[PDB]
Curated annotation (Swiss-Prot), chain A:
It comes from Saccharomyces cerevisiae (strain ATCC 204508 / S288c) (Baker's yeast). Involved in pre-mRNA splicing and cell cycle control. As a component of the NTC complex (or PRP19-associated complex), associates to the spliceosome to mediate conformational rearrangement or to stabilize the structure of the spliceosome after U4 snRNA dissociation, which leads to spliceosome maturation. This is Pre-mRNA-splicing factor SYF1. The chain holds residues 247 to 369 of 859 of the full protein. Present with 2170 molecules/cell in log phase SD medium. The lineage of its organism: Eukaryota, Fungi, Dikarya, Ascomycota, Saccharomycotina. It comes from the Eukaryota. Coiled coil: none annotated. Belongs to the NTC complex (or PRP19-associated complex), composed of at least CEF1, CLF1, ISY1, NTC20, SNT309, SYF1, SYF2, and PRP19. Signal peptide: none annotated. HAT repeats lie at residues 1-23. It is found in: Nucleus. Belongs to the crooked-neck family.
From Swiss-Prot, chain B:
Belongs to the DEAD box helicase family. DEAH subfamily. DDX15/PRP43 sub-subfamily. Present with 16900 molecules/cell in log phase SD medium. Pre-mRNA processing factor involved in disassembly of spliceosomes after the release of mature mRNA. It is found in: Nucleus. This is Pre-mRNA-splicing factor ATP-dependent RNA helicase PRP43. It comes from Saccharomyces cerevisiae (strain ATCC 204508 / S288c). The lineage of its organism: Eukaryota, Fungi, Dikarya, Ascomycota, Saccharomycotina.
Length: 107, 179
RNA sequence: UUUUUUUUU
């Protein structure tokens, strides 16, 4: 970080940070912060399920497929808060998989 | 539940009302086989005699109790845990826990809604690979009753069953973690 | 839309 204010070599530094302290990777991922959303999705796939949920919700709020991804996160991580995010997905689009999103709550 | 439905059928056949109607007439009015029902009564009598012989308690619970159907389902899982099907997450058709085979629900099954976890009685091959006589069940009950067969270590790598079975496990462990 | 067999007065 002292070596330069920022270009590819810094990405190599973030790469070494990610290859091997989760904070060390998350910070480099933050400085790096759709392909970034995809790599961040891979980071969520590596899993801090809550922080990954924050990265995903930020990725959507930056999408119905992404809502399906967050619903998959509800299927994995963790219930009423999931019902609230499901309410957000419902308000975002009242269309037929939403009942399956409600199914994760399953009073 | 198909099994629950069968229980309803026999309980209605052995009812005083069905005897006041015409039993055989009552069977010929509700589209039921009298031969099968009487044979079932006979078999039930034999099995009851055997249970009384080897000293098994005849026990039951009130219909008013909400744990009635749940008790029945659990007792079903006690013997039929090896025969369980899971609906494909976000797709069509079912797949069996045992030997991992793609299957479908038999057209004569009562369940009109998609219950993702079911216990079945018969496996039948005809036009397609069909699953006959089913009843919805909670994976929690399955894990509780047969932990020996439902340890994650037994099953093949990340498939549709194991993927959400492990989610149910995460759930269980979170429940234990909070207590 | 797809039950071959059998399972104690």
């Amino acid at each position: 970080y002292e070596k330069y204010l920022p270009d590819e070599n810094s990405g190599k530094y973030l790469p070494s940070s990610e290859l091997p302290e989760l904070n060390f990777n998350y910070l480099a991922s933050l400085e790096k912060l759709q392909y970034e959303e995809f790599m961040r999705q891979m980071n969520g796939i590596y899993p801090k399920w809550l922080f990954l949920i924050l990265s995903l919700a930020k990725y959507y709020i930056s999408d119905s497929c992404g809502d399906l991804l967050k619903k998959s996160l509800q299927q994995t991580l963790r219930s009423d808060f999931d019902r609230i995010y499901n309410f957000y997905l419902l308000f975002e689009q009242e269309c037929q998989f939403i009942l399956g999103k409600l199914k994760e709550n399953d009073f | 539940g198909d099994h629950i439905t069968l229980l309803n059928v026999y309980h209605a056949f052995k009812s005083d009302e069905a005897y006041e109607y015409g039993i055989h007439k009552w069977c010929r009015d509700h589209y039921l086989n009298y031969r099968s029902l009487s044979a079932a009564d006979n078999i039930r009598s034999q099995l009851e005699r055997l249970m009384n012989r080897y000293n098994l308690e005849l026990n039951t619970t009130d219909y008013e109790s909400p744990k009635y159907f749940d008790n029945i389902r659990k007792a079903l899982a006690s013997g039929f845990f090896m025969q369980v099907a899971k609906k494909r997450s976000g797709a069509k058709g079912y797949i069996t826990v045992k030997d991992n085979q793609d299957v479908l629900i038999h057209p004569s099954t009562v369940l009109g809604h998609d219950a993702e976890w079911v216990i079945y009685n018969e496996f039948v091959l005809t036009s397609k690979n069909y699953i006959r006589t089913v009843t919805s069940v909670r994976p929690e009950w399955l894990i509780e009753i047969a932990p020996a067969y439902y340890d994650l270590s037994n099953f093949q790598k990340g498939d549709v069953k194991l993927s959400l079975e492990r989610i149910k496990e995460k759930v269980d462990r979170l429940n234990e973690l909070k207590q």
